[PDB]
Amino acid sequence: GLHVQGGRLLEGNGNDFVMRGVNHAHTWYPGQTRSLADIKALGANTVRVVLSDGHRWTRNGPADVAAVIDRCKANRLICVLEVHDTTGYGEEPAAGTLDHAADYWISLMDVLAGQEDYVIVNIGNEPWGNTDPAGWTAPTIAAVKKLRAAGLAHTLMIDAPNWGQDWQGVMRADARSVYEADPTGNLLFSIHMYSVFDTAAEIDDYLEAFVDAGLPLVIGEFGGPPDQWGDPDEDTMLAAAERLRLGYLAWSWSGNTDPVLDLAIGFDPDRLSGWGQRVFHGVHGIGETSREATVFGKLA
Ligand code: NA
Ligand code: NA
C-alpha cells in the first residue's frame, strides 16, 4: 500500500508520490458529486475529502465513505479522508476529540479494508486551537497508537495545533516523538499554511525543518488571498513544495461561507476565481506539476 520510506511517500510499487491536489468539502455538499471528476480534469492527482464523525456535523456513514473512496478511484485520484469535527479543540466550543475521531475511523475499517493503495487517513483536521497547544501531543500520540492497535494499515496523516498552522512550533518540536508512536512508520505530517506563513523565510524554514530531520511533510491546506491577519505567500509555498518535492493540497474546491477561498465559483470548473487560476494554471501549479499516481496505470 501507500507507505513512507526515507521521508518520502511511496506507492506499493515503490514509486515516489507527490500530492498535487485540493480539498473538497464533501460532508457539507453531498449534492456536488461531480466535484471529484472536475478536480481530476483540471490535473489534480489527490483530493482531501472533508468528512464528519458526527460530533459537530452530520456523520458520514460507512456506505457514504465507501462511495467516496470508490468515486476517488473512478477518477484516478488518491484520497485523503479527514474528520473535520476536531477543528480548533480547546478554543472552538463545538470541537470533538481525537479519540472520538479514532473511534470513528475504527468503525470505518470494513470499508477502508483493501484500499491502502488509495486512501490515507488524516486523523483529525486542525485538532487543537491556540489555547495550550502543548496539550496536542499526548492525544495525537494516543490516537496513532489506538488506530494501529486496531489493525489499521493505511498511511496516516497528522495535523498540527494552533488551528493547523503550528505557529507555536509544537508539532515541529514533537514530530519525532509522534512519528515514533507509529510502529509501521507510515505516517505523514501536514502543515496548513495561511496568514502565519506570510514571508518566504517562514515557509522555507518550516518545510526544511521537516525535510532536514528526515520526516515526511505535506502542505495539507494552504491559502492565498489575504485575510485580516495577513497575506499568505502562496507563491513561495508552491515554489518551495516543488523544490523540495513535497505534496500540497489547496483549500478549497468550492462552497466556503466566505467565498474568497473558492478555487471554482459555484462548483463550476470552467469558472475559476483568481485563486483557482493561480493554483491550477500558475507557475508551480497543479497543471504544471501534477503527476497521476502510478497505481492507476497508463490511461487508454
Ligand atoms: Na482550515
Ligand atoms: Na497571498
Cβ–Cβ < 8 Å for 273, 4: no
- Which of the ligands is closest to the CA of residue 225? 2
Q: Is 70 annotated as a binding residue?
A: no
Of 20, 13, 50, 8, residue with least CA distance to 187: 8
The CA radius of gyration of the chain, in Å to the nearest whole number, is: 17
Q: Is 185 annotated as a binding residue?
A: no
The contacts of residue 71 (CB under 8 Å, 6+ apart) are 33, 36
- Dist. CA 220 → ligand 1 center (Å): 9
265: left (phi over 0), alpha (psi -120 to 50) or beta: beta
Catalytic pick among 11, 116, 221, 292: 221
Task: Enter the resolution in angstroms.
Answer: 1.6
The three cell numbers of residue 90 are 480547546
Full residue range of the structural domain in which residue 33 is found: 1-300
Cβ–Cβ < 8 Å for 261, 223: yes
CATH of the domain at 53: 3.20.20.80
Residue in the structure block whose three cell numbers are 491556540: 130
State the burial class of residue 110 (Cβ atoms within 10 Å of its Cβ: 0-12, 13-18, 19+): exposed
Cβ–Cβ < 8 Å for 166, 160: yes
Strands 78-83 vs 119-122: parallel, antiparallel or unpaired: parallel
Q: What total number of domains does the chain contain?
A: 1
Residue 30, amino acid: P
Q: Is 91 annotated as a binding residue?
A: no
Q: Which residues of 55-68 are buried (b: 16+ CB within 10 A; e: fewer)?
A: bbbebbeeebbeeb
d(CA 25, CA 198): 25
- Dist. CA 222 → ligand 2 center (Å): 10
How was this structure obtained? X-ray
Length of the chain (residues): 300
Of 17, 20, 26, residue with least CA distance to 51: 26
Cβ–Cβ < 8 Å for 156, 187: yes
- Dist. CA 83 → ligand 2 center (Å): 27
Residues in the chain after which the chain is broken, C→N over 2.5 Å? none
The contacts of residue 203 (CB under 8 Å, 6+ apart) are 193, 197, 233, 236, 237, 240
Q: Residue 242 catalytic?
A: no
- Which of the ligands is closest to the CA of residue 282? 2
d(CA 65, CA 81): 9
- Dist. CA 226 → ligand 2 center (Å): 5
Q: Residue 126 catalytic?
A: yes
